[PDB]
Amino acid sequence: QQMGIYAVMIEKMILRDLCRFMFVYLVFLFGFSTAVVTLIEDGKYNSLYSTCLELFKFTIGMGDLEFTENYDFKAVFIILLLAYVILTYILLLNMLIALMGETVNKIAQESKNIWKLQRAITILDTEKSFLKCMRKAXXXXXXXXXXX
Amino acid sequence: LAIVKFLLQNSWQPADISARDSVGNTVLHALVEVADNTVDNTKFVTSMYNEILILGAKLHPTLKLEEITNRKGLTPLALAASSGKIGVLAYILQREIHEPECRHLSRKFTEWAYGPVHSSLYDLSCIDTCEKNSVLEVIAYSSSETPNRHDMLLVEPLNRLLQDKWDRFVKRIFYFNFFVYCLYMIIFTAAAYYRPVEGLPPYKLKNTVGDYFRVTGEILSVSGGVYFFFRGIQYFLQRRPSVDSYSEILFFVQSLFMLVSVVLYFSQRKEYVASMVFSLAMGWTNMLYYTRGFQQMGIYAVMIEKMILRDLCRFMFVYLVFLFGFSTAVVTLIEDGKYNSLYSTCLELFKFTIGMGDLEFTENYDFKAVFIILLLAYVILTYILLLNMLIALMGETVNKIAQESKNIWKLQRAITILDTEKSFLKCMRKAXXXXXXXXXXX
Secondary structure, eight states, rough: HHHHHHHHHHHHIIIIIHHHHHHHHHHHHHHHHHHHHHHSSSSSSSSSSHHHHHHHHHHOOOOOOOOOOOSHHHHHHHHHHHIIIIIIIIHHHHHHHHHHHHHHHHHHHHHHHHHHHHHHHHHHHHHTTTSOOOOOOOOOOOOOOOOO | HHHHHHHHSSSSOOOOOTTOOOTOHHHHHHHHHHHSSSSHHHHHHHHHHHHHHHHHHHHOOOOOTOOOTTTTTTTTHHHHHHHHHHHHHHHHHHHHSSTTTTTHSSEEEEOOOOTEEEEEEEOOOOHOOOOOOOSSHHHHHHHSSSTTTTTTGSSSSHHHHHHHHHIIIHHHHHHHHHHHHHHHHHHHHHHHTTOOOOSSSOOOSSSSSSHHHHHHHHHHHHHHHHHHHHHHHHHHHHHOOOSSSSHHHHHHHHHHHHHHHHHHHHHTTTHHHHHHHHHHHHHHGGGGGGGTHHHHHHHHHHHHHHHIIIIIIHHHHHHHEEEEHHHHHHHOOOSSSSSSSSSHHHHHHHHHTOOOOOOOOOOOOSSHHHHHHHHHHHHIIIIIHHHHHHHHHHHHHHHHHHHHHHHHHHHHHHHHHHHHTTTTEEEETOOOOOEEEEEOOO
16 A cells, blocks of 8 residues: 555656656757757767767766867857756756656645555456455445444 | 616706727726726626626717727727736627617627527627737737736637637648648758868858758858748737737847857858757757647647746846856865866766766866865755755746636747737638537536
8 A cells, every 4th residue: 555556656657757857958958968969070979979979968867068179169158058958957956856746736635535445456456367256246334433 | 776777867958878088998997997807896797898888889879889889999809808807808709788778888699499408699709809909819918917918818719719710721821830830940950060161261162062062051041031020020010019928039039049150151260060060959849839729739748838037037036146156266275277267167076966077077166175164065956956956946946837827828829829920910710609509507
């Protein structure tokens, strides 16, 4: 129950929140990385993939800031990197946490329903998927509230 | 009321029910002006309004009272909407009257009702009022001075009307615009990505497939650039501008950057590109604008805008202040080694915030314990205290916004739709509302 309800949040969190942050992250990272590749003539940081990977590290927590020397008009390259970090590493990562905080507040009662549903589906299937082997097939609940 | 009646009905001098005050306002205009969006306010204005109309139609049936414009060209409705008097605008939208002479006055007529079921019909003046103003048009591009502008779309006649268009024609129109824009981006990037390395551009065109392809892209991208600049100018001029409605400004700015780059290129300066690099970056981010009309994504984009200026802006000031102070304290500290330069020390100080902070980066400082104390304090107040604070504050902007940020998204689709039809050549387009209904209540 504690772990299963937790797993529901991970699934809920992943597609909607993670999916949303991923799109913008790909859009920002792609744009800025392209802007950088244009910027650098040589040194293997020219390759779009290579620049893009270097740009990713900023998000991971491994960002190098000024990784490559072989660029012209140096102040612009730094401006490009500072803007990418401010909008994208800080503004996004901190935003993602707050939005995650939202999915968590709304879910939990809903995420208990989902967990309850999942056990039911697992149980229902095994008996059906259990060969419909001999199994129970009266309900009553012991009760005591007064009301008296 | 009684005196309103006695004024209009008396034997001695009946009031002219349509007279205009110095500002052009009639009694219906004045009532709109006297509304203050409180529940009991709406209630009294709303029915005194009703009362005036009932008296107009009783006493002087020929008079189309609603239609009378104040000095500024505003019908009562259009004033209501210009000044965020929403309860009253909503009442006008929802007006329904049934009595002899009722039909001329009423806003909504209901026609099909089945034991379950109900239908509502809306006039509707606001959508089709090309000649002077539209309720949607007034709401869609409001001053942003007005106390209540975001709220208004919600009312049933306008909000449903807007949703209805998008399904029928407009969304299909928007996607083609988005797709067309996307290609412009791949091209701007592609030329820039593949631009020739060799100096003193522009180098003469090669007799190669690659030279032919890249050159088309460069021309296409600049041409793409002009479109925004032309569209942009119209908004400044046509939009009667005017830091509000930023997305248009960003589109204008990115294009301007692209234009400046073009001026530099023909000048033949090597740096034309730095202009180009800025122009390319501005464009991809502006792709974030195209998210709207996707409900989950568009609402999300509103939070990014809301988050950015107020929260990001606030954290930025203190961050610049702290980082500047401490960095200066450090430069003084170090005699030599290139960590003396204020910019260099400041950049080294920044890394602490990124997550790349070096702690003790430089040896060549005196009184070493002090330098470490300086760096530890900067980290404690500034990396941890700030970054963790920024997250909590962001958590706050998020909680307050979301309902508000849904209103903003709704507003943005409306503005996009309203403009395309107006900005769509005012091409032939719809210009009856009713809502299928079924609640009992029975």
